[PDB]
């Protein structure tokens, strides 16, 4: 799984292609690769620019933009591909939560681990790493 | 008035073997998951006092 | 639309039948029996 065998051309023999079947954080500066060099595919409908991170403290939950995929287990080449898959850690813009580290340097980012499987629903829930 | 079709009662040998395999699987699962006051004298007995002594 | 088998229209027709709807058939059968007796007498006369 995780790699659909796309087929192309009048004769679908080689097909020269694969496509991810799961959500991915493509990044702000994607700028789609030209199709002739395009082997892997991350269709935009599966992409998400935000995740429903929840802070264990105070019980609050807030929708915040995703920032980067830090550590994906199970062949972190998927982390290079940005896949979440129910457990991948992801950086998030925690500035909305009001977190402020000691010394007056206000925080604006914190790690978070996705919990819900992206494939089974369009929301990307995650528990904040306090 | 217009009687509707009734479900067949036939054993459905295929379904029988499948239910047997599902039962063995459920038994294995219940066994794997297993690792995780006296009533007293019944009322209305004629001789409740005799047992006390 | 009401069905041809509908009980309400059939009961209404049964109620309507009691009057002229039956009297006309009665007078028609009486005239037919009279014409039959006349045809019988016309044959018996000869």
């Amino acid at each position: 799984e995780m790699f659909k065998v796309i087929k192309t051309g009048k004769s679908r023999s080689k097909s020269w292609k694969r496509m991810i079947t799961k959500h991915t954080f493509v990044g702000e500066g994607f700028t789609r690769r030209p199709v002739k060099m395009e082997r892997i595919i991350r269709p935009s409908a599966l992409r998400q620019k935000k995740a429903n991170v929840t802070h264990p403290e105070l019980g609050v939950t807030v929708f915040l933009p995703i920032l980067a995929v830090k550590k994906n287990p199970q062949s972190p080449m998927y982390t290079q591909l940005g896949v979440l898959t129910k457990g991948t850690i992801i950086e998030v813009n925690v500035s909305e939560l009001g977190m402020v580290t000691a010394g007056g340097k206000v925080v604006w980012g914190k790690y978070a681990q996705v919990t819900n499987e992206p494939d089974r629903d369009g929301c990307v829930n995650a528990v904040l790493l306090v | 008035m217009r009687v509707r079709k009734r479900q067949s009662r036939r054993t459905s040998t295929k379904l029988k073997e499948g239910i047997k395999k599902k039962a063995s699987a459920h038994r294995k699962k219940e066994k794997k998951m297993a690792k995780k006051k006296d009533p007293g004298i019944p009322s209305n007995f004629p001789y409740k006092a005799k047992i006390l002594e | 639309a009401k069905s041809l088998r509908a009980s309400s229209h059939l009961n209404a027709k049964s109620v309507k039948r009691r009057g002229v709807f039956q009297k006309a058939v009665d007078a028609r059968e009486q005239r037919i029996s009279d014409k039959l007796k006349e045809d019988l007498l016309k044959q018996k006369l000869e």
């Binding site: 659909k4 079947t21 269709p43 409908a45 089974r120 629903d121 369009g122 | - | -």
Partner: protein, 349 residues
């Protein structure tokens, strides 16, 4: 539309609404599917199911968005009346929440119809369809209170009297128990309670009657009190708005009898406090229950208070009583005469 919007789609509580929607989706759309079916078939099945549920929610919301009066830009009279009745701001906030839930259900159905195409397994499409139906239910779950408020205002707004402000009208006014309800009962066929207790009519009443080969609609109003334009209920404010927004010879009934135990000086004070409203209305005062008082015997000091009513040129102190209806015909004749005299002058200009 206007004039008694009885065509409202009979909005239902959000729980029953979500139940009817889920039932219609389960019943109309195909249900059976099997793991061995081609994945494209299961995908089209779940897509048709989600699209049917979303279209049903969109229709259920659009029917309410379209059938409601749209208080704004209807008429100042109906606008002020519905504001006094249903708390216009809350009436707008409820329909705004309805439109917000409709747009949310639309965005959810679209995002899930887009995400559903990529499902590689029957369980994934099933979880996606369940997620869409649950998002639609949660959007409906927050709409319960606004939907109940809309169901209440529909039950109230659908029984409001028909009226066209441009059409000829004659308002009636006076202290409670004065017999103004009896005057409306006598001047027209409209039925109204005439019980002795003060506020026999808690809301506006209307009653058509022909005259001079022309239609007319008497409009009783639910009483008024001498208060400093702030200590008043919606009923009294709804009555004052009916006078302010309706021209053509509002009637100010009065009763000198000991019944309706407010001193006649208080009636003159109320007539003075309401005087500015009648700057163009061509006031026609109408004493009531004359048979039991016959103000010809009235004390000269109390009669002087009537002279203060005469300071405005347009007043006419007609006499009338329920026990002698023949004078009521003369009052209606004078009212229609002043009405035609004003309208014909307005038309020639």
């Amino acid at each position: 539309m206007q004039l008694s919007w009885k065509d409202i789609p009979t909005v239902a509580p959000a729980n029953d609404l979500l139940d009817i929607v889920l039932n219609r989706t389960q019943r109309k759309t195909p249900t059976v599917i099997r793991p061995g079916f081609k994945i494209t078939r299961i995908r089209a099945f779940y897509m048709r199911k989600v699209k049917y549920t979303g279209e049903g929610f969109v229709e259920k919301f659009e029917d309410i968005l379209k059938g409601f009066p749209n208080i704004n830009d209807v008429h100042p009279f109906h606008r002020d009346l519905m504001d006094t009745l249903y708390e216009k701001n809350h009436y707008k906030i409820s329909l705004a929440a309805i439109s917000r839930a409709k747009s949310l259900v639309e965005q959810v159905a679209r995002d899930y119809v887009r995400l559903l195409k990529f499902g590689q397994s029957l369980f994934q499409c099933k979880q996606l369809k369940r997620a869409a139906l649950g998002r639609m239910a949660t959007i409906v779950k927050k709409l319960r209170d606004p939907l109940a408020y809309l169901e209440q205002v529909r039950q109230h707004i659908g029984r409001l009297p028909s009226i066209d402000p441009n059409t000829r009208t004659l308002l009636i006014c006076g202290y409670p128990n004065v017999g103004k309800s009896s005057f409306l009962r006598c001047i027209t066929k409209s039925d109204v309670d005439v019980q002795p207790y003060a506020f026999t009519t808690k809301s506006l009443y209307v009653g058509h009657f022909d005259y001079k080969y022309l239609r007319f609609q008497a409009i009783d109003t639910p009483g008024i009190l001498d208060r400093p334009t702030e200590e008043m209920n919606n009923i009294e404010m709804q009555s004052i708005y009916a006078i302010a927004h309706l021209r053509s010879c509002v009637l100010y009934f009065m009763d000198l009898s000991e019944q309706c135990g407010f001193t006649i000086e208080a009636q003159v004070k109320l007539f003075h406090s309401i005087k500015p409203l009648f700057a163009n209305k061509s006031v026609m005062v109408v004493i009531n229950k004359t048979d039991i008082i016959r103000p010809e015997d009235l004390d000269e000091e109390r009669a002087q208070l009537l002279e203060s009513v005469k300071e405005v040129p347009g007043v006419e102190i007609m006499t009338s009583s329920c026990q002698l209806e023949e004078n009521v015909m003369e009052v209606r004749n004078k009212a229609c005469e002043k009405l035609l005299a004003s309208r014909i002058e307005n038309k020639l200009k």
